[PDB]
Structures are given as C-alpha cells and as structure tokens.
Structure 1
Amino acid sequence: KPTLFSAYKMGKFNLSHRVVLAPLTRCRAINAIPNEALVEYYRQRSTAGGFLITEGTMISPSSAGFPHVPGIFTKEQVEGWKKVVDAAHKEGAVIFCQLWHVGRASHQVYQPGGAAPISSTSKPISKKWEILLPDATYGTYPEPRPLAANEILEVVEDYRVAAINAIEAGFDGIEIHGAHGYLLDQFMKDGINDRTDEYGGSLENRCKFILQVVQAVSAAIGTDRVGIRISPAIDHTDAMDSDPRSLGLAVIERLNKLQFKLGSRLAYLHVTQPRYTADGHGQTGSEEEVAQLMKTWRGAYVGTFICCGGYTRELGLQAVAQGDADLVAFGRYFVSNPDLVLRLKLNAPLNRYDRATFYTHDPVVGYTDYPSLD
C-alpha cells in the first residue's frame, strides 16, 4: 500500500519514497554557472531513489528575475550542471531541472542591454510587490513588453533547447515552470492576460503557449522526461484567475489529450496550493475549498501527481495514504533540513529555516551549513 515512505514507479524512473525536493531559488549560482556550492547543496539532500527538482534555471538571457540564478543555455552552464548531476546520481537520486522564464517579473538590470522584460501584456506587476535587485535593495517592477506571436515561438524554441541541454548535462528530465505568476502563468491567468489575439481570451487561447512548450520539450527529450508545474489558485505578484478550478481543469484536459494523442504519459503534473495559516505551513474554509480543488485536479489528471505548498509530515502522510497525491514536495523545510527524508522517517525535529539567507549568495552561510542529524 502507498505511504509517504513507500516506493513508486514514476514512469521511466523508480523512486524509493515519495518525499520530493521542491524547486527553490537560492541565488548561489554566481554569474549563472552551477558550481561546487550547488554540488554540495543537492548532494546533501540526495537519497537513494529520492526525487530532486532543481531551483528555477534560466532558458535564455531574458529569463532572469533574480541574481546569481543558474542557466542552462550555454556550454559553460551545462558543464557546471554535469558536476551537480553526477554527484546526485552517485547518491542514487533522480533529478529534474526546472526550466524557468520569469516574464514580466523582472527589471531592466536583469535584462540584456537593459531591455524591458517581456510578457503576455504591457501591464506591470503592481507596486504592492517589489523585486530584489542585484545590489540587495528592492526595486519597482517595470512595464513589460508584450510578445508578438513570432516571439512567443522563439521562447518555445528556447525551452526546447534548454531541455536538450538538460539531457546533455545528464539530468533525468525537466520540469516546466508554469506557476507563480511567471511567464507562462502570465498567459494562463485572465487576471494578467489582456491579449486580443490567438493567445488571449478563451481558455483554449490562454493555454496555447504552455501547451506549445510541453509539446516541444516532449518532442525533444520524450514525454516521460517532462514534468509540468502550475498553480491556478496562487495569487503571487498579481497573478489571479477569475476561475482557478476551470483554469486548472483546462490545463489538465489538454495534458490528458496530448498524452492520449502521443501514446505516453508525462513524468508528472505538479501543483502548488496556497495556505491560510500564519506561517504558511499546514492547516488552520478557504482551506477546505483549496483542499477539494486539489483533489478534483488530481482526480481529473491521468498520471502522476505531485502536491506542494505548506505540507507537513502529517499532511504529507495523509496525502499519499488517502490517494490525494503520489508524491509530496517540500520547499522551505528542505532549505534547513538537508536530510529531510531521514528526519521525516524518524519523526525527528525539523531545523528552523532562516529566510534572511534564502537569497543571499554565500556558498556556505545559510546554504550548505544547516546540520544533518549525522
């Protein structure tokens, strides 16, 4: 019977337990090159048959919206990732690279030639939100430039190339970052997408871009090496949809149809959910609604389902035991608990995490120096 600590066949891959390292931007990849700090970071968190998803990784120079995040669009970057991947594999881990384009959630200082960030729209993120700049101050999100149709196809090509480069680096697969108000979410969410062309309006039009990406990377490296992450009900950086339930089901129906058409299943669907507790962990109304949404989306998707967002040991156990999810990803707890899988198995205390060093750049401090049990 399925439990949080029981084995799982994720299509092509075999896992020994259901605890997953959620993708986490940490900003230690100085000048976008994966390095020895990242090697130790992922090695520390690796387990035999444990699934790891990397931090968001740039698919292009226009992809960036944080400092010192890794890319996978140059040979030098690929060579850096090889070292990370080899170390993870030496521990028996399965590791996917998350492909990340931030869209309008960026700033001129992050853009080639100081160009405007690109998006579905010309509308900027509101002043209620601010962006961390490379000089450790916070700045204003600028007006983005809306992509023309041919430019969207160029971004699809960037994802395709990024996927091929990931496989060259030895990654087991990739995850399409389609969540949290970044580029693809800027097209899906009717709170952001005000386009009047073939990429705006209907759910069909709004889902077109992300489906083109899924189709392209599946063609390049195989459906069974492709995972997709979405967050229809998370509002981060003004990324709301008027009907998250329908948006989620629209994406899922299209994934199901693509799988049926091509004759194989994607590696997984990965959905993050909002929480309504003070600290954003665990459970307290909106809670019950969100919980049912997640069960509805799980039930509608044909294949492996990863849940994420505020899961605890008890909630992770329940999720797998009751069939609500096949795999459970952990973000913040994995920051401060390199041996999180062991700690969960032993019901050991979890180290507190320090948010002040989430996005600083030191290879050791607040990055690789959280203690393991051993």
Structure 2
Amino acid sequence: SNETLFSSYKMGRFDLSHRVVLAPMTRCRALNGVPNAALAEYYAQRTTPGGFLISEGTMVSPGSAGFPHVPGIYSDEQVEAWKQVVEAVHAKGGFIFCQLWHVGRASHAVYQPNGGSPISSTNKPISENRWRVLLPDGSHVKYPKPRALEASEIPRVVEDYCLSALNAIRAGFDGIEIHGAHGYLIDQFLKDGINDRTDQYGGSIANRCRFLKQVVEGVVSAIGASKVGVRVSPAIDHLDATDSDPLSLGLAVVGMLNKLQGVNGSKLAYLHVTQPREEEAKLMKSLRMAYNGTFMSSGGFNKELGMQAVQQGDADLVSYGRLFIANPDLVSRFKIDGELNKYNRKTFYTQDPVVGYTDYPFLAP
C-alpha cells in the first residue's frame, strides 16, 4: 500500500497521527511506587500530537511488582500522582495507555506484602540459571518458589485489574493495556511451559487462555473495549515462558479476543504482540490476519522494518522500546531519517529522574 509509519490511523475513538508507538517500558523511576514529575517529563518528552504511548508496566495490586520503583495504579495516592504524567501527555496531544502489569512469579519476597510468596498459575519457580529478579539495591537474585493461585482467588486478581483499570481512567489515561506477555502472571497461565494446572485454568489451550479471558472481560466491562489493549508474546521465552506451540496459543488468544469483540459490540483498542528477535514473521502475520482489529507489533523494529510492517499490512502500529528510551523525539527522527541516539542499557532500570531517563537529547535543528 502507500501507508507508512506516518500515516494517520483511527484506533477507535483515538485519532492517531502516526503509527509509532511508545512501547511499555519499565524504567523504575516511580520511586516507592508513585508516579512523579520525572515520569511526567519522560512521557511528555516522548509525546507527539496524535502519537500513542503506552506506560511502563504498572502495578494492579500489592504484590504485582517484580522490579523496583515501578508505579502502581491501585491506590488513590497513585491515581492522583499519575495525573500529572497523563496531563503532560495530553497537553502535548498524545494518548497514553496505562499498562496493567502483574508479574506473578517473576517477583521476590521483597516485593510482596508481608514478604510472602509471589503468586502464579503454578507452584514452580522460574529456573535459577538464566533469570534473576532485580531487587531495589540493584542486586540480582534467584526467583523464588511461587504459590499457585487457587481457582477461588482468581476473581480477586481479576478484580484488581478492574479497579486498576477504573483507576487508570480516573487518572485520565485514555485506556489501559493488559500486560499478558513476557512470562508474567497472565503469561504464566497462557504458556504450557509454565501452566501445570489441572483445574479449569490449565490443560487445554482454552483453559490456559481463561485467566486472560476473565481479565480482559473484566477490564472491558469496567471501562469499555475501545480503551483496552491486550499485549501478548506467544513466542517469547522470557522467564521460562515457552509454549509447545506459540502459533496455536496466539490464535487461541486472538480467537478469544475476536469472540469477546462480538459478545460485547466494540473492538478492543488493539492487540499488541511482541516478536521474538523467518517463521517468526509467519507467526506475526498469522495472528494479525486472524485478529479482527488493530494490530500493534513490537520487538526489534527500527524505522525501515516499521515502515514495511505498515506498508505490507503486517501491522497497523509498531511500538518501539529501546529506541524510544534514547530518542524522546523518535517519531521526528524517523520522519526525517535523522540520527538516532544510542540507548544506554546501564540506566534502563536505575532510579535517577534525569540520568538515562529525561537527558537523552532531542535533535538539533
């Protein structure tokens, strides 16, 4: 087609000016779980008129975090502190979705109420050799043994997503994204690499999708489908989050979202899928073809790959992470094929409100 990253797009009620999306990225500047003026600056710097942004993963409940200084949206105090970020984005003409993030077993007693065990689909820990939880002192230690949720406690978790989603709207977010990716709580139910349940939430593909289904249904009922994006990564093996067949899992997720869109009358805001980064683009093309709606692809995109993803109909929208970390004006830079600042990995997850956060420079004229 003649569509590109700079073609406008209608994401339901949201009129986007372009297809470049700020991927949700944990940066750990939200000291003590509270959004602050530093996040406001950071998101404002990255906003464009009609540009879509997705927040760093945001706690839906105490115990839902597995990184230091990540924001929450479950408490009044967080809702209020988020306003400044959201106002700052809106002042600059962006839309911002709050990513509702539950890490499940990818946590530590440090991040749990009463230093209790992280919850998950399973009682099995993330394996100890490839993965670590980052603690607030900057150490990396092994993930602990989680406590499998009883089926009876799942509706309370769903309700946390709902309250958090209602809080997000309260704070002024244009909507929310369900973080159902990357081996976190939802993905711990989704993936047969993890989900060793024998009740209604495990076994079949459908059972594995049930938690995500209830989360999405719950959030969609509370705030409206058009304000809900869903993110999944069927083929990302992060935190042991494998599946014997990513394709079919992804199609089950897609199928379930197609079904919810008929059972409810409105489209979701989007399906957001991470690429692992051949066959991979076949998996992505398949999900996008299957999904009746806006498709947001993510993972390893640069401009060129983004332009072709849009041009060739592989995606409506392309989220950028690391490039957006380092390039507040990423969209402009892409538009004029200008220089790209390099990202500094070392300050991805540090705490300074400025350093490695809001101090990556805009283009010179």
TM range (shorter): over 0.9
User: What is the rounded CA distance, in whole Å, between the counterparts of 1:24 and 1:18 in structure 2?
Assistant: 18
Shift of 1:231: 0.2
- Alignment partner, residue 328 of structure 1: 318
Once the two structures are overlaid, the 10-residue window that deviates more, 128-137 or 79-88, is 128-137
Q: 2:193 aligns with which of 182, 191, 194?
A: 191
The within-5 A match list for 1:249-288 is: 249-275=251-277, 288=278
User: What is the rounded CA distance, in whole Å, between the counterparts of 1:21 and 1:162 in structure 2?
Assistant: 21
- Alignment partner, residue 180 of structure 2: 178
The within-5 A match list for 1:1-374 is: 1-128=2-129, 129-275=131-277, 288-374=278-364
User: What is the rounded CA distance, in whole Å, between the counterparts of 1:173 and 1:136 in structure 2?
Assistant: 32
Shift of 1:353: 0.5
Q: Deviations over 1:135-177 (max 9, x none)?
A: 1111110100000011111000000000000000011000000
Once the two structures are overlaid, the 10-residue window that deviates more, 132-141 or 38-47, is 132-141
Residue aligned with 1:69, SS = coil
TM, length-normalised to structure 2 = 0.98
Shift of 1:315: 0.3
What is the alpha-carbon root mean square deviation over aligned residues? 0.6
User: What is the rounded CA distance, in whole Å, between the counterparts of 2:259 and 2:355 in structure 1?
Assistant: 46
Alignment: residue pair count: 362
Shift of 1:323: 0.6
User: What is the rounded CA distance, in whole Å, between the counterparts of 2:242 and 2:358 in structure 1?
Assistant: 35
Q: Deviations over 1:261-281 (max 9, x none)?
A: 111111100000111xxxxxx
Residue aligned with 1:106, SS = coil
Structure 2 residue identity aligned to 1:27: C
Structure 2 residue identity aligned to 1:292: K
Structure 1 residue identity aligned to 2:281: A
Structure 2 residue identity aligned to 1:307: S
Q: Deviations over 1:225-252 (max 9, x none)?
A: 0000000000001110000000000111
Q: What 5-or-longer segments of structure 1 have no aligned partner?
A: 276-287
Q: What 5-or-longer segments of structure 2 have no aligned partner?
A: none
User: What is the rounded CA distance, in whole Å, between the counterparts of 1:73 and 1:257 in structure 2?
Assistant: 29
Residue aligned with 1:55, SS = strand
- Alignment partner, residue 279 of structure 1: none
Residue aligned with 1:40, SS = helix
Shift of 1:12: 1.2
Structure 2 residue identity aligned to 1:134: P
Shift of 1:62: 1.0
Structure 2 residue identity aligned to 1:322: Q
User: Identity, % of aligned pairs?
Assistant: 69
Q: Deviations over 1:51-91 (max 9, x none)?
A: 00000000001101000000001111011111000010000
User: What is the rounded CA distance, in whole Å, between the counterparts of 1:109 and 1:335 in structure 2?
Assistant: 27
Q: Deviations over 1:2-26 (max 9, x none)?
A: 2110100001110001000000000
User: What is the rounded CA distance, in whole Å, between the counterparts of 1:12 and 1:97 in structure 2?
Assistant: 17
Q: Deviations over 1:307-341 (max 9, x none)?
A: 00000111000000011100010000000000000
Residue aligned with 1:269, SS = strand
Stretches of 4+ aligned residues off by more than 2 angstroms: none
Structure 2 residue identity aligned to 1:23: P
Shift of 1:258: 1.0
Shift of 1:131: 1.2
User: What is the rounded CA distance, in whole Å, between the counterparts of 2:146 and 2:245 in structure 1?
Assistant: 25
Structure 2 residue identity aligned to 1:255: L
User: What is the rounded CA distance, in whole Å, between the counterparts of 2:26 and 2:309 in structure 1?
Assistant: 25
User: What is the rounded CA distance, in whole Å, between the counterparts of 1:105 and 1:227 in structure 2?
Assistant: 22
Structure 1 residue identity aligned to 2:191: K
- Alignment partner, residue 278 of structure 1: none
Structure 1 residue identity aligned to 2:247: R
